[model samples]
Target: LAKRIIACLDVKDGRVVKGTNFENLRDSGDPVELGKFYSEIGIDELVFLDITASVEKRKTMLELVEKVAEQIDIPFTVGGGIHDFETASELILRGADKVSINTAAVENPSLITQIAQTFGSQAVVVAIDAKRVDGEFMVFTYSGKKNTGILLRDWVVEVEKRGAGEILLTSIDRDGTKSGYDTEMIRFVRPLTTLPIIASGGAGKMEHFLEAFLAGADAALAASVFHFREIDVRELKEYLKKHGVNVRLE
Candidate 1:
């Protein structure tokens, strides 16, 4: 399989915003425009992470996903505040090919099985937010709401068994750092699961993506670099090709 380049749209309400290490949010741009832009340039997938919380924003979030979904003709994934079957199904019916569950999955392991059973495992993406604690990776929830104190190894293995089709691993340490990806985290979790792993966070340059691939990630996800137009997906793919990384360049 060819390596994939994913563009992450961190949506707050309807606008796209990116956070630094899960703090200090910065405005990115309109989700629809960014989504269309990436899709036009052949982004492998578009991940819409609705950062807006509370029941008040959920309605708008759904509509926003629908708007972007109407334009992007690629694998579209949606996440954020999805805590039950109804919400998950809502996104799927609204045009999201995949629904990513993070805190909700950890809180309710059966949710993963339920979604997989309903839409097939291929539509379920389990997103894991991890941070190093005393040199060991610890799972976090609610976008840094609290530490779950669970080992990364244990959680990853269980998610796969619970019917997660793919795993999105985002290192809280490297998130928005613009240094590089958490190759260490990717390497640590790579051998644990048979499912495709999407390495996220800390993509500063094209080489960082290659580093993630070398560490065994099936795909690479970046935000700040792409949101700010610091890097182009087409050019990045070309660079990867020159480095011997097989990627779909159409």
Candidate 2:
């Protein structure tokens, strides 16, 4: 399959924002506004991450997802506070092409299997947030605070075995740094699983997308740069095409 360039929407209180390593973020734009804008500009896909999808804010969060989903025609994915199969199913039915579950799936590993089986694996995308700790990779949850004892790769293998269709792996250390994607994360996990892998975080420019492609990700998702108009999707696609990477530019 050809590699894809996906624009990510990090929404905090219904506003588009970019956070550094998942903390201390500034607003960039409106999530719905950006979603429509990106779709018009030819973004391959869009991801809406409700940064404040905590227990207290669940109602408003789902409303936001439904509102934004109504405004865009492109393939979109929703994440955060997606705790159970019912919640994930609701989001998919609300027009989310994919539903990404992070902390809940980690806390209740069976949720992955249940969702995948009930909704089809292709509709369920597992999100893994990892930070390099003392030369070892560790899994984190609940906005990067809660730690699961399982190592990143081992946990990913379990998720895949349980029938996760795809993996959206992000590096907590490199998120919003704009240095580039963590190639090590992609390289380590790519060969172990058969599902498509989407590299997320630390994409600052067109070249970073190139680096992700070279590292073996089926798709690359990023936030900050795209939101500020620092990198245009069509321009990035042209750049990637020139670099000899197979992509869908139309």
Candidate 3:
């Protein structure tokens, strides 16, 4: 199987932004423009996450995904503020290839199954944001602010059994650090589920991507590195190819 290179757009108030450790966010660019650019550059997939949807207590804006879907031809996943069948249905209708949920899924596990039953299991992406706490991986909710006391391993198996098509696993400790992915966490979760696991956070260099893939992650996602242009898209793929990592070049 070919490893996937995913570009993540963390949107706040309709503009793409980047933050470290889930705080101090700064603007990057417009989601539509950035999404189009990445797609044109031959990025494998695009994930548009609403950074403030749940904290703001509002639904994800339909207009954002409308423009993104109009531009990107690759797989597009929209997330944040998706808590029910209505918002989930609206996102799919608005042209999102998949609907991703984080806090919502933890609050209501049935929502995952509901979306899967109505739209197919392949349409749901459950994001699990976790951080190390006292030598154990703990899950966080509400954009990594709320620690739910749930073990990451337990949640991984739970999400897969509940019909989640994909898992966007983010390490809160490594997010936006520009150091590297938490390969230890990736390796720990790889054998726990059959769902496609997208290793997120960190990813500062080409080596970071290679490490995550070598750790058995199906895909690697990054926001700040790509948003800040720290690593070039095609250049990174070329580097990965040189390292014996199979990835999409077309």
Which candidate leads in lDDT?
1
Once fitted onto the true fold, the runs of candidate 1 whose alpha carbons sit more than 4 angstroms away are: 18-28
Clashes of 2: 0
Candidate 3 TM-score to native: 0.91
lDDT (C-alpha) at residue 11 in model 1: 82
Alpha carbon deviation, residue 77, candidate 1 (Å):
0.5
Stretches of candidate 3 above 4 Å error? 18-28, 52-60
lDDT of 3 by residue, 35-131 (tens): 7777877689999878665545244468787777877788999887777899899889888999899999999888999999999999999999999
lDDT of 2 by residue, 1-250 (tens): 8888888877777776653232223322667766776788768889887767475456656777688778888778888778898888877876788899888888888998998887789988999999998888899998788777779979889889888889999999898598899998899998889999999989888998999989999999987787666787889999999999999877
Which window of ten consecutive residues has the lowest lDDT sum in model 3?
A: 19-28
In the range 1-250, model 1's lDDT, one tens digit per residue, is 8999998887887877753232223323667876776787768998988877686666977898788777878898998888999999988998899999999999999999999999999999999999999989999998877999999999999999999999999999999698899898999999899999999989998889999999999999987787776887889989999999989876
The most accurate candidate by TM-score is: 1
Candidate 2 lands at a TM-score of: 0.90
In candidate 1, where is summed lDDT lowest over 10 consecutive residues?
19-28
